[PDB]
């Protein structure tokens, strides 16, 4: 339901939302917001030339939703890459730093904080 | 055998074990472990209200067994579904993303591993 047709990686946002919002993740969620203190927007591009965005609010209460903007504020970080590369990145087939360095991943806002997000997200979302 | 009475789909665990362990599939088994690097637990539910779990260890040696934990470590990802839908899924009669969108399939654990295993 955060999934959008024509973006095959987007199903991942539902899985991330369920993991992060799981009330058993309350502590992890709070620690992640403390660490990240950031609203991160993902702008995905597909081959048909479409753009779709999702937000990850690790700054206020912890939320994942559809849109290029949290309802509780503007993005601190914007990450722009293709559907394909986002898939690869979530799988671990591509490294975010290599994608950045080869022009596949564009970042607006702090690149150091951007790098840290991967590990901070991993911890908050992982509800097993 | 890994299958359990009242779980019609559970024969797939015996099937997966034999197919994975077939000496002819040594290269494939190795690649799957290399690629997945994950312990997957299946929690199945039936119409009688019962729950049974199996694990598929694609991180260590490639074992399939009964229970909600591998002996050689904790689960990275957990899939919960009904006996009925799991059978459909295994027989290529239902799609995993569709089951997940309609709430028939519940996923817990590492999003990276979840992504990696689906393929
Ligand atoms: C390798 C598996 C990753 C699983 C976690 C999914 C979250 C993906 C978001 C990654 C954010 C990192 C962006 C790095 C930006 C940079 O420093 O170039
Ligand atoms: C016929 C092969 C099936 C036997 C092996 C069982 C594995 C089937 C389950 C597929 C994994 C589903 C992961 C999708 C979760 C998601 O990211 O939405």
Pocket lining: B18 vs ligand 2, CB cutoff 6 Å:
no
Q: CA distances (Å), A25 to each of A20, A76, A113, in order?
A: 6, 23, 22
The angstrom resolution of this structure is: 2.2
- CA B105 to CA B96: how far, in whole Å? 7
d(CA B17, CA A118) in angstroms, rounded, equals 34
The domain locations on chain B are 1-119
Tell the CATH topology of B1-119: Nonspecific Lipid-transfer Protein; Chain A (3.30.1050)
Q: Please count the residue pairs, one from chain A and one from chain B, whose beta carbons lie less than 8 angstroms apart.
A: 47
Q: Which 3 state secondary structure label does DSSP give B94?
A: coil
The three-state secondary structure class of B109 is: strand
Q: Which two tokens stand for residue B40?
A: 């997957």
- Kindly write down the DSSP assignment for every residue of A66-81, as one continuous string: ESSSBTTB--SEEEEE
Cβ–Cβ under 8 Å, residues B105 and B94: no
Which residues 6+ apart lie within 8 Å of B6 measured at CB?
B46, B48, B50, B83
CA distance A3 to A12: 8
Q: Are A20 and A120 in contact (CB under 8 A)?
A: no
Q: Are strands B77-82 and B106-109 parallel, antiparallel or unpaired?
A: antiparallel
Are the beta carbons of B107 and A1 separated by less than 8 Å? Answer: no
- Give the contacts of A103 (CB within 8 A, at least 6 positions apart): none
How far, in Å, CA of B40 to CA of B87, rounded? 17
The CATH fold assigned to A1-128 is: Nonspecific Lipid-transfer Protein; Chain A (3.30.1050)
Q: How far apart are CA A62 and CA A55, in angstroms?
A: 10
Method: X-ray
Looking at the complex, does the CB of residue A97 fall below 8 Å from at least one CB of chain B? no
Q: Is A58 exposed, middle or buried (0-12, 13-18, 19+ CB in 10 A)?
A: buried
């Amino acid at each position: 339901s955060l999934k959008v047709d024509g973006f095959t990686s987007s199903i991942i946002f539902d899985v991330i939302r369920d993991g992060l919002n799981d009330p058993s993740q309350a502590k992890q969620k709070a620690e992640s917001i403390k660490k990240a203190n950031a609203i991160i927007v993902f702008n995905l591009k597909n081959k048909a030339g479409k753009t779709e965005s999702w937000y990850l609010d690790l700054k206020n209460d912890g939320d994942v939703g559809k849109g290029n903007k949290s309802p509780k504020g503007d993005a601190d970080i914007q990450l722009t890459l293709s559907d394909d590369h986002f898939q690869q990145l979530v799988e671990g087939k591509a490294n975010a730093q290599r994608l950045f360095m080869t022009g596949k991943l564009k970042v607006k806002g702090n690149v150091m904080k951007a790098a840290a997000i991967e590990g901070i997200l991993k911890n908050a979302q992982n509800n097993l």
